Amino acid sequence: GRETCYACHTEVKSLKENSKHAAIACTVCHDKTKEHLEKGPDVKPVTKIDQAVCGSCHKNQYESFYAVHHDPTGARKEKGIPAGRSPLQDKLLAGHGFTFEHAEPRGHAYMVVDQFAVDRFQGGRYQFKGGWKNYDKVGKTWDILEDRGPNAKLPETAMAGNPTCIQCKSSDLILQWKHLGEKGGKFDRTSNVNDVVKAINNPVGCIHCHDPHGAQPRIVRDGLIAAIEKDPAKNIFAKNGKTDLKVIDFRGFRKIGVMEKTDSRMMCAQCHVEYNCNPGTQRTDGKPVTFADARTNHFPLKNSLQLLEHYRSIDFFDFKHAVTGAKLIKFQHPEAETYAGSAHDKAGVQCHQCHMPQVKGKDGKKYSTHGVVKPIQMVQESCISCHKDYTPNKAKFMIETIRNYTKGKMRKSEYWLAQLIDTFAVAQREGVSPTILDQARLKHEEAHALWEYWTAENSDGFHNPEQARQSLTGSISASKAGVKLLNDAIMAVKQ
Amino acid sequence: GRETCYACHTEVKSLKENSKHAAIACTVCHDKTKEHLEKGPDVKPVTKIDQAVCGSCHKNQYESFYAVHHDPTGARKEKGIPAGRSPLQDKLLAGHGFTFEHAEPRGHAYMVVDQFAVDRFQGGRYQFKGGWKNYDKVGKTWDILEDRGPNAKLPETAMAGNPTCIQCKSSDLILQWKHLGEKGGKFDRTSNVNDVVKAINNPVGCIHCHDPHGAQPRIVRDGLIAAIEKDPAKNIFAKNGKTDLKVIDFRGFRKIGVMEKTDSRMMCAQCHVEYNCNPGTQRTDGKPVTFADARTNHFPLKNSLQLLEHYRSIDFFDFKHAVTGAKLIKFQHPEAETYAGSAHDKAGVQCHQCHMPQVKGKDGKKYSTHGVVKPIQMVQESCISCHKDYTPNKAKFMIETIRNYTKGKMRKSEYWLAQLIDTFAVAQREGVSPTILDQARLKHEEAHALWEYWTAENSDGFHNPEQARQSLTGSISASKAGVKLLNDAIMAVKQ
Amino acid sequence: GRETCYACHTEVKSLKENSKHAAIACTVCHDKTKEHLEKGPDVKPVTKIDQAVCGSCHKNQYESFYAVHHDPTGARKEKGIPAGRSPLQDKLLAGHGFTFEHAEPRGHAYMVVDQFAVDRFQGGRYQFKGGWKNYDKVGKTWDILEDRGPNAKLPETAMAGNPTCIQCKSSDLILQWKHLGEKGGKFDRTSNVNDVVKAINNPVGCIHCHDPHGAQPRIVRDGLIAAIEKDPAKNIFAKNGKTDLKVIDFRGFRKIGVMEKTDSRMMCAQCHVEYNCNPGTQRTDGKPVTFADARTNHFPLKNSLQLLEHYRSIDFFDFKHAVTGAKLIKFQHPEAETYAGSAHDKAGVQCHQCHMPQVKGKDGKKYSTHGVVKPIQMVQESCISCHKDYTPNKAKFMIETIRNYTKGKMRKSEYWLAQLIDTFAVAQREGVSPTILDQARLKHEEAHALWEYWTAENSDGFHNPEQARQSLTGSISASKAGVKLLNDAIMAVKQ
Ligand code: HEC
Ligand code: HEC
Ligand code: HEC
Ligand code: HEC
Ligand code: HEC
Ligand code: HEC
Ligand code: HEC
Ligand code: HEC
Ligand code: HEC
Ligand code: HEC
Ligand code: HEC
Ligand code: HEC
Ligand code: HEC
Ligand SMILES: [Ca+2]
Ligand SMILES: [Ca+2]
Ligand SMILES: [Ca+2]
């Protein structure tokens, strides 16, 4: 009966006919279709967004996404500890909700539960049922978490969660959210986040990267489609002055982007980017930037060396540093923007080659693992598969040397920003002129942008070692210049 | 001839007859008994306190206690290093003898030698014979250590050792120390520690936890029996408004506590607790608290959330912080008080199930290992034995996740106390009012009590994750409140 | 024809005849000898300094020196990171070029390339060809590095490289450098370093430690021969009031030192020592000390407890600390001076026994490995070979316990110097008297000398645990004394 459907749903016909999934009957994925025909287009069919339906025919992709592994060093790894990825986090992000809890990432299957349970999300409201002993459970959100209710309080939490956060954790609102989270769907940017979490049962769906109608490689993230549309010729995924994306607009309500050829750069960039998904402040007037404003669901697609200019051009910053008052940018996991134009990218390698390598299942069917891999833990498939001359030690050696050298500059930029911050408080206290203190704030802005990008980014330089060195040494230079300007000023007091 | 003995030693008869050790002749453990009969009760028999006599019939318990293992990461692990368990120790304990040396614990067989040789004990007087190459030797104290004499000095040492320390290192003074170390035995609290160390040949004896007369599970520690007697209904080991302990008082001179059923919580709490075993100061008048005072050999049996109130109620603190002058409590290894009322305790699990698991000896006799185990290093017997569904990775994952999350809050509380301490010195220097500085000291008291308990405790949260989170976030809140009060005050100067 | 040569080269005859290499024809190592005879001693023969000629008859020594290994934790390990060997490097060495980059050592075959490429050498001018993916390549310098040219700049670099540096990286200038780098050879101390690097093709040559003419164990380093000649009776390698070295002086131009018996202490001390190879300042007048001055290529051969006195006696220091102005000594890898008079040295063990242990090659020929070994990574040959009762765990345990205890004192001395430095800036700012500030500078001098020696030295105490404890506790004492003097002074302001 698809022809009857197709009379009214012509884009679906275009994706589905003569495709890999051509023969799949509609009722496989959609329930209540008879009521939809009979009663008309008031009675919408039900589209349950759900991995297990793809799993029925794609079991190795489904099993590997859900497989439970246990890293013997644990998870919930706070970054802000002496031996961690961001040892001076509490000082350098003073004034930001990340200081309440920010841990290293873990597996994809945990993404909703970890978003909802982290100390910075919603005041500790949502917790794992049964506590720590069930921290490794996968599946449905509300089988794993419980809701302690709106009036419960837990000490040293924050309330940074909002609806836009969910757009990088699940495909469950694909039909229930208007492009950008503008008003008109069941939920939008201004929704109460605690109404929204109830509807998220599942982590990133299979449909996030694969069209259900015709199995075409795709993107569904609003912010990512929008950024590419803004900059169709020069954006990080472009080639030859265009990008391999066709935007399909459904009813004026929501878009997808279909690509002729798999580009896991774009598919992983639906989440692995710097973004704004939060309220902020305007640099010019200091006016609030609320969820009313499109700037609160936004993807720059710019790297470390471009981002301070970019946020100044859209008159936006995230928080004032608690000590210096500097108008800082908060950075988050810019892996796509870092990877852009690195040695591997310019070689045509994509994220999935190192992070979703080929493994054999079952009997012995070849597939891309959909439990994403930490390359250092799997160098034979993530690296040696292509670098056939490498031994596992060599692969490890190369990953660690680059991170070693990058980390040395990261720790040195932190030492310098801490010096900047300590010098500034001294300079204040001895009331050095607000003019001078303001020159120092620009120094902080610059040194912070060129530093925090790399604690937020998760490769410690491996994704782009040149850009990391350039950025971090820029940060150091910025901070030592601020420290010299302030000390010059502090002397000039009793002068 | 035991009947003749029994005419005069009626408690022994009560422990020994119809027991597991009924048939053991007295002369097995006691020498000079004929002179005792013949010459009378002036000539006391000799009771050599000594593991090797139990070993003669209990070889697997004896061999496993003495077995030498070599951890390839070494021992003598100072806590106060950037990657260690207490990275800000030197700043936060400024003014306390722990700043001279405080290392992580190692095996039981080393306990006397490590107490005597640590840099904080007695000015470096006692050293390992032959130096580092014999650091792993077990056995008799004075076969392993040498006495460089009373006038030798070693730089950057302290002289914190006293007799009461020995009561958690050996059973060797069981007959030679009057309850609490009151005057009347060969040694008491006011003895010169260098007279006492000469009499300690052996680490914790087999008799510390097992009655020699009838093999009944027991405690011998004075401080522990006393605390339970103070609080027989509500103490951490109680149940149903009483505790499973019968106190046996010998001649008015020394007590034991026998339990009808093995409770390794109590048996390990003879040492693994917070204690006072040191001189201190009175909070009200600032008067010294010397060894004359019973407060110097004392067990609170209270957890992190109760201890500041408890030490205020007995008008006692350990040291003024070198910078802030805050009247701090010094905390030590409160493992029993932490474990109380945690998930495993409420499940009826005891310390020995994870730390003394079942192993097979010899031929293949089943026994509890008496070389106490670090569970993460032995998850198959310490964890999987009960959690039969766990893989070794899962067990490790659970231990490390909890420690990971706990440690993130510990490091964040340290960042905050360091901020408190740095802010205070600023506030002083700019002479903010001693009234305000005093409000800040209370903040320090509170934030320190809720922080240092967890560096002293050895599980990094695993023993009680809820109480750890509650305490540490309390510390943070306390410190950020102090820092806000002081900064408010520091501005109010040039105001 | 050697007799004809010998008529004019009589020292060579003395080394070569009746030796292990007696039969080797001259033309094996020297080309153009006929032109030298025919045209005379204007046409010098060519002596290509080159491992591969020794390799032709000594293949196992050559292969093991060049073998490529890949440490899976990587290389380029910056010291100045929280978990590294010198976590407070940026603060404590403020004002020195080491703050731009100082990493842990790696294999011998990398020594030239790492000297030329490090961020502190020559402004980033020299880089690995092909970047990170060729960081593990060995062989010829200029097959591995490229020269970006004199006008290229890279941010956050330094320009500390000079010709004297090369003397601890290669044997390539053995015939082209006059003793001490005095003027007269192709290169000397005042040469432009960028003229010199072009002539260094190879790392340390086989000839650095082995005479080519007669295979005698030897030294070629100018600074080392000179120090031993200064102090022939009492120097660290002496015995019975002399040293086992015969100095051979060729034409007044360059010296070797031949030893009757292998002493790898001396042979490794050609580089593994504290040295001055840099310009400096005079303590008395503050006058520059330039390459004109012999003090710029100099070996003290003194340990941690002697070096401050030694540098004061030759009126030399390296840099003023950027904050305190203290006239500091910069220390570098004093492994020979530390090892002197330690337990292993007094037992007659030499560096090569632990670092070049016996291995079997090829078929199964026994040899000393010439890829120098990190003992902890090879305890069976580096330790158990002599300590036959040791298990690999025990060996590891002993190395790590000593480093553990040593590191605890190192981190505590760093905490104290940082306190000194922070206190001093406070004391300045509140202008405490330059007299008092000067007493503090002496405190800094002393605490720095007794601290930085051990971050520079590479064993973390294992080479000499007693001297390490003595030095580091001396540093702590020095710093806490400075901190007390300054605080006493800072109070005495508003007094
Ligand atoms: C699972 C394998 C599917 C099969 C087979 C079919 N559809 Fe589908 N459809 C499915 C998903 C998961 C979604 C949600 C949105 C997304 O792009 O992933 C949908 C959505 C539709 C819609 C809504 C389009 C819009 O206007 O915004 C229509 C109208 C739809 N699906 C129709 C449709 C028809 C007519 C089918 C048989 C020919 C059919 N679908 C098969 C998943 C699946
Ligand atoms: C948004 C819906 C996402 C998309 C699309 C991709 N990733 Fe992701 N990733 C995301 C989250 C929120 C997390 C953290 C989950 C948590 O609960 O902590 C991650 C985690 C990873 C990791 C770490 C994996 C692990 O430790 O086990 C990697 C390596 C990873 N992500 C890479 C990755 C790649 C290559 C993608 C395209 C194929 C990709 N991610 C998609 C969010 C989302
Ligand atoms: C091989 C040439 C890679 C490509 C292409 C991409 N990544 Fe990567 N990633 C790489 C390494 C060696 C590391 C360091 C940590 C490791 O595990 O080895 C990383 C790190 C990540 C992380 C951190 C999680 C983890 O895997 O440890 C993420 C979240 C990640 N990378 C994502 C990512 C994305 C989105 C990519 C394309 C834009 C990308 N990676 C490319 C190796 C390689
Ligand atoms: C093929 C699909 C690749 C996979 C998977 C990985 N690498 Fe790679 N690498 C590849 C190419 C074509 C290049 C370009 C230069 C060249 O040899 O042609 C590289 C580059 C590197 C480098 C240098 C990187 C830099 O920033 O300059 C290293 C150190 C490297 N590659 C190692 C590496 C490792 C460890 C991988 C697993 C994470 C890995 N690569 C994946 C081809 C491919
Ligand atoms: C070792 C297995 C023992 C055997 C058999 C017996 N005794 Fe014992 N006794 C032993 C120890 C290790 C100690 C010290 C204190 C402790 O409680 O562990 C003792 C102590 C006694 C005492 C002193 C009691 C007091 O008044 O404070 C008496 C009087 C004593 N032991 C008597 C005794 C008699 C009469 C025995 C044979 C029937 C006998 N003991 C057996 C260890 C051992
Ligand atoms: C006082 C006499 C003690 C009793 C009773 C118990 N323990 Fe203990 N323990 C004590 C000391 C002084 C030390 C440190 C020894 C040193 O020289 O450093 C310890 C050490 C442990 C450890 C660490 C073991 C190791 O690293 O190898 C654990 C796990 C341990 N202690 C647990 C433990 C348990 C469960 C007890 C009751 C069965 C117990 N201890 C008794 C002091 C004393
Ligand atoms: C299993 C449910 C446990 C019980 C009951 C007890 N402990 Fe524990 N302990 C546990 C873990 C997982 C850890 C973390 C470190 C590890 O090695 O895995 C600990 C830690 C200790 C330590 C530190 C020494 C060490 O084992 O690493 C001590 C000294 C210790 N625990 C003592 C102790 C006491 C006295 C207990 C009953 C009050 C107690 N533990 C219970 C696991 C478990
Ligand atoms: C390699 C195995 C060699 C053989 C065989 C011979 N010589 Fe050599 N010689 C060689 C080296 C590597 C060097 C450089 C300096 C050093 O001491 O390593 C030399 C140096 C000479 C010199 C210069 C001495 C000086 O006056 O400063 C002479 C004159 C020399 N070598 C002569 C010589 C003669 C006459 C030989 C055959 C009998 C001969 N050499 C063999 C390496 C080798
Ligand atoms: C000057 C010509 C040297 C002589 C002679 C010796 N060593 Fe050395 N060593 C030197 C350098 C410059 C380096 C660093 C190389 C780099 O590129 O980083 C080293 C390194 C070592 C190491 C570390 C080895 C490694 O990590 O793989 C050791 C253990 C070592 N050196 C010891 C050593 C010994 C025992 C020597 C005499 C036999 C010796 N070195 C000679 C410089 C020179
Ligand atoms: C065995 C008794 C040794 C002797 C003799 C020498 N060294 Fe050593 N060295 C030793 C150990 C156990 C360590 C600690 C690090 C390890 O790898 O085990 C060291 C360290 C070094 C280093 C650092 C590089 C490294 O090997 O990790 C160097 C550069 C080094 N030692 C040099 C050196 C020299 C020059 C010696 C004679 C003066 C010397 N070592 C003696 C063990 C032993
Ligand atoms: C003609 C008139 C038809 C026919 C024959 C079918 N559908 Fe639809 N359908 C139609 C309209 C106008 C609407 C939506 C109006 C609106 O809310 O904007 C729809 C909606 C759907 C949806 C859901 C979109 C959402 O969840 O927001 C699905 C999944 C869907 N239709 C499927 C479908 C199938 C399988 C049909 C043949 C059985 C079919 N439709 C017939 C209009 C018409
Ligand atoms: C009756 C009178 C007896 C008899 C028949 C025995 N003992 Fe004792 N014993 C007795 C007294 C009054 C004392 C101690 C007086 C004092 O110092 O307080 C003791 C002491 C012991 C002790 C030592 C206690 C200590 O070390 O402080 C031991 C181990 C002991 N007695 C054992 C013992 C045995 C085995 C006897 C039968 C052979 C025996 N005693 C007989 C009084 C009397
Ligand atoms: C007599 C006259 C002879 C004879 C028969 C030989 N050589 Fe030499 N050689 C001689 C002199 C005076 C000089 C150097 C003068 C100077 O520059 O100081 C040399 C030099 C060498 C060198 C090089 C030293 C350097 O590189 O600076 C070598 C390697 C050398 N000679 C080797 C050599 C051999 C193998 C001879 C026999 C074939 C030989 N020489 C003959 C003087 C005389
Ligand atoms: Ca952002
Ligand atoms: Ca205490
Ligand atoms: Ca030096």
Side-chain angles (χ1 to χ4, degrees), chain A residues 44-95:
Chain A
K44 291 172 150 327
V46 160
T47 308
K48 192 208 11 65
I49 298 318
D50 186 46
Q51 290 96 339
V53 182
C54 323
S56 69
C57 290
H58 291 306
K59 80 156 156 86
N60 274 328
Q61 299 76 5
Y62 178 94
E63 289 169 8
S64 59
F65 181 76
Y66 284 110
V68 162
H69 304 103
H70 293 107
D71 185 324
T73 69
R76 207 137 176 191
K77 305 180 169 166
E78 170 65 46
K79 286 165 71 169
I81 67 172
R85 287 197 62 245
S86 182
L88 262 167
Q89 166 172 286
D90 280 295
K91 186 177 179 84
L92 302 188
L93 301 187

Side-chain angles (χ1 to χ4, degrees), chain A residues 274-276 311 318 330-332:
Chain A
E274 156 55 15
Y275 68 100
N276 199 78
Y311 280 120
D318 284 274
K330 172 79 181 94
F331 289 82
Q332 290 95 335

Side-chain angles (χ1 to χ4, degrees), chain B residues 274-278 311 318 329-332:
Chain B
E274 156 55 15
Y275 68 100
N276 199 78
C277 59
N278 39 272
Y311 280 120
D318 284 274
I329 297 162
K330 172 79 181 94
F331 289 82
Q332 290 95 335

Side-chain angles (χ1 to χ4, degrees), chain C residues 2-187:
Chain C
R2 54 172 81 183
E3 267 327 304
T4 300
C5 309
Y6 288 147
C8 291
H9 294 302
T10 54
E11 304 82 342
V12 172
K13 192 170 190 175
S14 357
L15 305 154
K16 182 172 171 65
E17 299 291 296
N18 301 126
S19 89
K20 304 297 262 257
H21 277 183
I24 311 164
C26 303
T27 55
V28 175
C29 302
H30 292 285
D31 274 320
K32 272 197 204 174
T33 57
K34 312 300 338 230
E35 308 155 86
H36 188 51
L37 283 170
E38 262 89 316
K39 310 300 275 313
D42 293 296
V43 186
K44 291 172 150 327
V46 160
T47 308
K48 192 208 11 65
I49 298 318
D50 186 46
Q51 290 96 339
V53 182
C54 323
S56 69
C57 290
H58 291 306
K59 80 156 156 86
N60 274 328
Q61 299 76 5
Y62 178 94
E63 289 169 8
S64 59
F65 181 76
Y66 284 110
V68 162
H69 304 103
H70 293 107
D71 185 324
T73 69
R76 207 137 176 191
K77 305 180 169 166
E78 170 65 46
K79 286 165 71 169
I81 67 172
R85 287 197 62 245
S86 182
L88 262 167
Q89 166 172 286
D90 280 295
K91 186 177 179 84
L92 302 188
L93 301 187
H96 194 272
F98 274 37
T99 65
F100 285 95
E101 181 169 19
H102 174 41
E104 286 189 19
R106 64 163 171 168
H108 277 168
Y110 298 105
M111 56 175 61
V112 181
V113 293
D114 292 335
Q115 182 166 266
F116 293 172
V118 70
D119 293 347
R120 66 181 193 269
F121 183 68
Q122 199 71 185
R125 179 169 173 173
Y126 304 100
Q127 290 306 334
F128 281 82
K129 285 188 218 294
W132 288 113
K133 70 199 177 271
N134 290 326
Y135 197 64
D136 63 340
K137 280 202 148 210
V138 291
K140 306 272 162 189
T141 301
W142 299 107
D143 290 342
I144 295 157
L145 300 178
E146 67 193 20
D147 177 2
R148 294 194 169 357
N151 304 126
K153 31 175 174 231
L154 231 197
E156 294 295 330
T157 54
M159 301 274 282
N162 65 64
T164 293
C165 305
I166 286 57
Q167 292 297 304
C168 281
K169 305 291 187 284
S170 184
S171 315
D172 290 2
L173 303 188
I174 193 168
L175 307 174
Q176 288 178 65
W177 177 258
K178 191 152 189 256
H179 185 76
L180 298 189
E182 276 310 322
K183 282 186 173 24
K186 185 173 194 147
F187 300 111

Side-chain angles (χ1 to χ4, degrees), chain B residues 5-6 9 16 24 26 29-30 212-213 218 250-251 254:
Chain B
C5 309
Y6 288 147
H9 294 302
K16 182 172 171 65
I24 311 164
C26 303
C29 302
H30 292 285
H213 295 127
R218 69 165 191 189
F250 295 82
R251 317 171 252 128
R254 58 170 283 258

